[PDB]
Ligand SMILES: Nc1ncnc2c1ncn2[C@@H]1O[C@H](COP(=O)(O)OP(=O)(O)O)[C@@H](O)[C@H]1O
């Protein structure tokens with residue numbers, strides 16, 4: 103039947119290597135059996151488009167001009183890939199609209215420009231309205247979640263997704279503002295202020311500049327915002343995920359360490375900071391490696407003022423704040439300690455070194471002991487102790503490991519205190535969860551950190567697909583309702599390759615058991631186990647030190663060096679002991695106790711989170727990066743199309759197009775709509791009673807369908823039944839009155 107639409111003047115989409123899809127118009131009517139189409143391109147040139155001799159499949163028809171730039175993609179006549187790309191291009195380039203709906207899921211595009219599209223009057227304008235009675239915006243999602251939590255008394259979750267830089271961090275912040283405003287009616291409104299204040303604090307400690315993002319979010323965050331019976335904020339709790347430790351000691355060619363170090367170095371001249379004995383960021387190796395200590399459009403000194411102000415608002419006094427700056431200053435002074443070689447396998451550090459002097463002074467430690475333990479290691483046996491001198495390379499490695507460890511304890515200490523400030527005495531009626539996770543990334547060189555983040559992103563896709571596609575269509579099959587299968591790309595195989603008993607993480611952990619274990623040996627074990635036995639896993643022709651894996655977004659090559667070390671993540675017992683013995687109270691609090699590998703800990707942490715998400719009603723936001731140049735309102739078609747297919751956008755709209763998301767059991771429907779039924783319509787069979795009543799209430803049979811155990815409805819029909827229920831109760835009250 104679709105071939106009847108291929109008439110003279112009809113428009114179609116044809117594949118193009120650079121533009122992905124090109125629009126063309128038919129110069130003649132198509133007849134079944136024709137091998138070439140005479141097309142007029144929009145550039146003024148005529149083309150003979152040859153059809154496939156085996157399949158005879160025609161190019162995609164283009165939707166009418168009235169359907170260009172629609173608020174909801176389900177309004178399109180032809181629901182195919184070229185149509186999606188065109189509709190989003192027009193709304194972005196022409197209309198400057200960043201938002202579009204794909205049913206319940208929201209699509210967000212990064213503008214690379216500040217626009218005033220979120221005044222409190224806008225917040226008020228989105229408040230109190232229906233879905234679609236406002237145009238697409240993040241506030242609509244927030245309001246829908248607010249509306250659902252209040253009516254359903256069910257916890258909700260806001261899940262944002264996308265590759266690095268797509269606007270995801272930005273989206274979560276604005277959603278929180280909406281809830282804080284509505285809740286703002288409270289007496290102890292300071293709690294909402296504290297909740298919003300949490301974000302900039304974590305950004306200072308948690309973010310750093312990458313080539314992808316000037317403010318990359320190098321840890322994960324999940325926030326539960328609790329509500330009372332009044333549907334007003336009671337408090338909150340943050341659960342966070344693995345921070346990039348390698349960032350403290352290393353930075354690439356145009357990257358920085360965490361923002362807070364630069365804020366502290368910018369404030370070195372102030373009298374309060376004088377005790378720290380700091381200089382500019384160029385003086386310390388841990389800050390200098392990147393080659394550029396400043397971010398354009400950012401004033402580190404100004405940010406330092408804001409960060410301090412944020413700390414005081416949470417109730418963190420100046421003594422606490424000066425205490426954290428001391429730790430950070432100490433990490434910088436440790437980074438420039440001079441270490442000299444003795445013979446081939448020994449090292450020595452002088453008790454005279456200027457940087458180690460202030461390090462020992464700030465930490466409240468003995469210089470002579472630190473010189474000894476940076477140069478030697480202890481081996482303890484039941485009967486005796488043995489000492490091994492360390493090489494120059496080992497001394498610097500030992501020093502750096504301690505720096506990562508200190509920074510890690512410090513980050514955790516801060517989040518614990520914000521959670522203490524965010525705590526609530528009252529009982530939780532319900533909650534809204536917000537997820538903010540580092541997005542898919544790739545570089546010239548990729549390591550263990552990229553492996554972990556990509557693996558986490560794979561899990562998010564699995565949760566999304568399980569809920570949206572898998573769980574949902576399986577129900578229709580069991581329900582015995584006419585259903586056409588909707589295809590999706592299932593990533594379960596790569597997930598098994600990573601997580602299963604035979605998986606990559608398990609093999610790395612087994613290599614960690616062996617003292618003889620090596621990255622080379624592990625890579626060889628991966629090749630032996632999977633080189634030609636697996637389709638998701640492959641090795642490049644030129645290398646034996648790296649491997650490539652097929653993720654949902656793209657294939658990624660990972661270098662094997664450092665994987666066992668990074669999986670172990672440990673520090674010498676003597677160094678931790680000298681810090682446990684420190685004179686400064688904060689250091690002993692971290693070093694006091696306030697076997698599984700980082701990879702094992704990471705898997706379970708993600709499992710607990712997946713389980714947590716499954717308990718709530720999800721609300722998904724898909725963020726897209728339009729261009730790599732960071733330019734205002736520029737659209738890259740090749741780059742966009744790959745993100746759309748990776749996100750499964752088209753199939754999400756096709757499943758949405760099938761409709762019937764709402765589903766009442768015959769018992770629930772009967773119990774809720776008994777008032778719309780006359781006593782004569784109530785048969786011994788509840789199922790037949792519901793059929794007879796629904797057939798009387800709704801005349802169009804295309805708006806509802808009957809399954810084995812549930813009744814299915816099209817959009818707006820339950821609201822119509824609620825209007826009828828409300829009208830019947832009102833009429834009954836008037837009759838009684
Ligand atoms: N509302 C916005 N207005 C302007 N630029 C934005 C907006 N949202 C995101 N961006 C741009 O996208 C970049 C990355 O988005 P952000 O949410 O900050 O981090 P990410 O998207 O990586 O989570 C920002 O640095 C900024 O350049």
Ligand SMILES: [Mg+2]
Nearest residue numbers: 267271318319
């Ligand atoms: Mg981010």
